[model samples]
Target: AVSADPNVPNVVVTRLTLVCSTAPGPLELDLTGDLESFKKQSFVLKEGVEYRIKISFRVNREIVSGMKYIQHTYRKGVKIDKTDYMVGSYGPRAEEYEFLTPMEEAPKGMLARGSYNIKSRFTDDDRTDHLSWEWNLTIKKEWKD
Candidate 1:
């Protein structure tokens, strides 16, 4: 199912899983996309650019009442560096999730070039034994100077 508010851009509500007998536990969602492919197409982005990414999943109507919708409790922003690589993760402000960390700014004094790989993930803790889903994005560099 697709739940688009019509007011949001690139945000869609999708169903990842359904279970009737038990609630789901904490879930780790992985979203991976090819940045190189995007770059090959000449995707345009600027250095030090910031972008916000939101993720949501659809819930089984039988298991969830009123509406079959669940928004990921986590949200994140990814910054594109001069070289085109973008990295970010979702977790509590105090602790980093497994294999994840807050996006770090690209190091200074380096000429950014070449294609990059952008990756991110989200987690759901609504219940135990529940279903989940995820999505990712890739920003490509269009200008090299």
Candidate 2:
């Protein structure tokens, strides 16, 4: 899992965690392996709640500058939303660093409760793609495993 990718360069993404106010536990995504493996896993979220994503990563040999998080959401095969976060820069370190996004309110109501596809990417000012993965999200009245 610690193996480095040439394309990813100076940073290794270790994990992605879903934190929510209504959930009893944190939902985690293991980013150490092939990102494609996560496509089949869908996270169930309670509708009309506050949630945020925690990103964990390790910098390799050099300094990583201007890192950013970009996410796109789709429903019924149609793009619904896109979000971008400035993750800033970091120097080489052994321990993983964490970044938490601002809390977001999930869509409420019957029309908004459904399944969505997400594309998450980590990039830099130079347009270097450090990590990219896909996952699914479902918003329901109750949280499900």
Give lDDT tens digits, candidate 2, residues 24-52: 78888888787777676677888868888
Q: Which pairs clash in model 1?
A: 14-58, 23-128, 23-129, 24-127, 24-128, 24-129, 24-130, 25-128, 25-129
Q: Which 10-residue span in candidate 2 carries the lowest summed lDDT?
A: 4-13
Worst 10 residues of 1 by lDDT: 14-23
Off by over 4 Å in 2: 1-8
For model 1, how does the per-residue alpha-carbon lDDT over 25-44 read when each residue is reduced to its tens digit? 21223223232333233223
Q: Please give each candidate's TM-score.
A: 0.27, 0.86
lDDT of 1: 0.28
* Per-model lDDT: 0.28, 0.79
Q: Which numbered prediction scores highest in TM-score against the true structure?
A: 2
Model 1, position 85: C-alpha lDDT score: 14
Query: How accurate locally is residue 9 in candidate 1, as Cα lDDT from 0 to 100?
Result: 17
